[PDB]
Write an enzyme that holds these catalytic residues in place. Sequence first.
Site, PDB file in Angstrom:
ATOM      1  N   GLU A  35      18.534 -53.902  15.577  1.00 36.88           N
ATOM      2  CA  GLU A  35      17.952 -55.039  14.779  1.00 36.88           C
ATOM      3  C   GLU A  35      18.212 -56.347  15.732  1.00 36.88           C
ATOM      4  OE1 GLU A  35      15.390 -55.100  12.830  1.00 36.88           O
ATOM      5  OE2 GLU A  35      15.244 -53.122  11.978  1.00 36.88           O
ATOM      6  N   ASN A  46       7.199 -62.487  13.166  1.00 37.64           N
ATOM      7  CA  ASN A  46       6.188 -61.541  13.064  1.00 37.64           C
ATOM      8  C   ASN A  46       4.994 -61.999  13.221  1.00 37.64           C
ATOM      9  OD1 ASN A  46       8.411 -59.840  12.163  1.00 37.64           O
ATOM     10  ND2 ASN A  46       8.504 -60.677  10.260  1.00 37.64           N
ATOM     11  N   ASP A  48       2.440 -61.752  11.325  1.00 37.29           N
ATOM     12  CA  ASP A  48       1.703 -62.466  10.055  1.00 37.29           C
ATOM     13  C   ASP A  48       2.373 -63.939   9.926  1.00 37.29           C
ATOM     14  OD1 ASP A  48       4.251 -61.906   9.235  1.00 37.29           O
ATOM     15  OD2 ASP A  48       3.565 -61.128   7.487  1.00 37.29           O
ATOM     16  N   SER A  50       5.622 -64.540   9.379  1.00 36.34           N
ATOM     17  CA  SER A  50       6.619 -64.572   8.766  1.00 36.34           C
ATOM     18  C   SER A  50       8.007 -64.538   9.999  1.00 36.34           C
ATOM     19  CB  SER A  50       6.891 -63.350   7.615  1.00 36.34           C
ATOM     20  OG  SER A  50       6.868 -62.213   8.488  1.00 36.34           O
ATOM     21  N   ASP A  52      11.923 -62.875  10.655  1.00 33.99           N
ATOM     22  CA  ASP A  52      13.160 -62.012  10.317  1.00 33.99           C
ATOM     23  C   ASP A  52      14.577 -62.749  10.883  1.00 33.99           C
ATOM     24  OD1 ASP A  52      11.294 -60.119   9.971  1.00 33.99           O
ATOM     25  OD2 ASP A  52      11.245 -59.789  11.900  1.00 33.99           O
ATOM     26  N   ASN A  59      13.275 -60.412   6.472  1.00 36.07           N
ATOM     27  CA  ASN A  59      11.948 -60.797   6.500  1.00 36.07           C
ATOM     28  C   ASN A  59      11.603 -61.716   5.455  1.00 36.07           C
ATOM     29  OD1 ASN A  59       9.222 -61.462   7.082  1.00 36.07           O
ATOM     30  ND2 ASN A  59       8.708 -59.118   7.413  1.00 36.07           N
ATOM     31  N   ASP A 101      14.513 -50.789  -3.182  1.00 34.15           N
ATOM     32  CA  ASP A 101      13.381 -51.073  -3.710  1.00 34.15           C
ATOM     33  C   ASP A 101      12.372 -49.984  -3.513  1.00 34.15           C
ATOM     34  OD1 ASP A 101      12.366 -50.916  -0.833  1.00 34.15           O
ATOM     35  OD2 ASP A 101      11.418 -52.524  -0.721  1.00 34.15           O
TER      36      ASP A 101
END
Length: 129
Positions: A35, A46, A48, A50, A52, A59, A101
């Site tokens: 990562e 990203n 969209d 957003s 990270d 994110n 989650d």
Amino acid sequence: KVFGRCELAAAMKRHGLDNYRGYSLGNWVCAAKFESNFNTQATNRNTDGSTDYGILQINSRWWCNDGRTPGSRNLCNIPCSALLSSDITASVNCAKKIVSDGNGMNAWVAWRNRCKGTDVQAWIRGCRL
Ligand code: NA
């Protein structure tokens, strides 16, 4: 801060990630490697809009507030800049909520594509843990 491999393993173990939700320590070290290349200051945007943040590339769409991701959530109740610190506490505590989650470590695309199904224990070989 750019962590050493065993340095990060020891810090992750001290913060309770070893076998957290059944994921052995090598999984977390492998995820961090692909990562962020162990760099707490890593950022990536990203498609969209957003972003990270940090060693586990958390994110802003769901987990932190960076002031530039409208309509998003802040489920870890932190500013995203906190995830870039040399102290990885905020990243580890937020990662615990993510992995809980329902999707496990599949939430991390790099883990699924580069760590899942491999010999992840190799990432802690040689370390004094
Ligand atoms: Na957010």
